[PDB]
Amino acid sequence: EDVLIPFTLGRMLGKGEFGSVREAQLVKVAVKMLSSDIEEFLREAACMKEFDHPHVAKLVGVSLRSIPMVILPFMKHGDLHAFLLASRIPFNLPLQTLVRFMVDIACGMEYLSSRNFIHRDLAARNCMLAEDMTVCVADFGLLPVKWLALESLADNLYTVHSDVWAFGVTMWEIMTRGQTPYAGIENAEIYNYLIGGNRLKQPPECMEEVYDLMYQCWSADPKQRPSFTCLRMELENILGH
Numbered sequence: 001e002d003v004l005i006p007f008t009l010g011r012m013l014g015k016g017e018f019g020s021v022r023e024a025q026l027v028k029v030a031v032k033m034l035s036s037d038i039e040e041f042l043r044e045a046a047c048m049k050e051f052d053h054p055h056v057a058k059l060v061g062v063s064l065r066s067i068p069m070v071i072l073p074f075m076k077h078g079d080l081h082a083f084l085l086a087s088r089i090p091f092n093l094p095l096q097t098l099v100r101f102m103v104d105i106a107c108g109m110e111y112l113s114s115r116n117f118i119h120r121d122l123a124a125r126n127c128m129l130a131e132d133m134t135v136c137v138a139d140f141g142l143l144p145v146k147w148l149a150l151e152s153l154a155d156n157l158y159t160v161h162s163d164v165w166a167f168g169v170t171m172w173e174i175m176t177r178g179q180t181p182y183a184g185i186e187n188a189e190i191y192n193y194l195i196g197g198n199r200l201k202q203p204p205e206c207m208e209e210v211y212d213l214m215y216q217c218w219s220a221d222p223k224q225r226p227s228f229t230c231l232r233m234e235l236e237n238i239l240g241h
């Protein structure tokens, strides 16, 4: 398949548990550094290559070094979490801009779920800012306890409904401008917090109707959480008002 790529590596862009990222010249790109495991990587790489949507990060391709590598378009504006943080610690964005980020993410997630694709790691840090400042869902997954639904934590179940829960957490991050969810509560106590009936609190300035929507995303019953289509409609209406 025209997905595999035989470029040269450049400056280090960042690193983490997932591995490291560096720029490369193919066109400037971002390159993600990571038997059986290397097998399905390639398998799922092929399905991700056919994503084609304005609010989903394109896959340029994949490659092999001697570690699996993911080749991505270089997005200079970086990720949404870093941007929200950079507003706070200082630019100011109207409510309109914050709700528009949510609409953008809801469109890309609507598209992914329409293709039966479960992200599993939706969070502000995994949303990228494009040149025109639109947001694109990224990092599809070729532990993040604070974004995980009850049934993901308890039963390891990942569905569109658990993607929707993490979308709700992402809405909260947007409204708090990049604050760590459940700050001062440890990962090991998150489940206990949640089956308690406790949720992330309404941010001080947050429009009630925006909080009502994100709150819906954290229903204990996965079937009670709105769809991405319903999220996008409600967010677009809010944006129009």
Ligand SMILES: O=C(c1cc2cc(F)ccc2[nH]1)N1C[C@]2(CCN([C@@H]3CCCNC3)C2)c2ccccc21
Pocket: 013, 014, 016, 021, 030, 032, 057, 072, 073, 074, 075, 076, 077, 078, 079, 125, 126, 127, 128, 138, 139
């Ligand atoms: O274009 C860049 C990029 C990196 C980068 C680094 C910079 F310092 C400045 C601009 C940048 N642009 N990247 C970075 C990632 C790969 C790893 N991801 C991190 C993983 C860890 C969690 N956050 C997300 C985001 C990405 C996905 C899709 C399309 C492009 C890009």
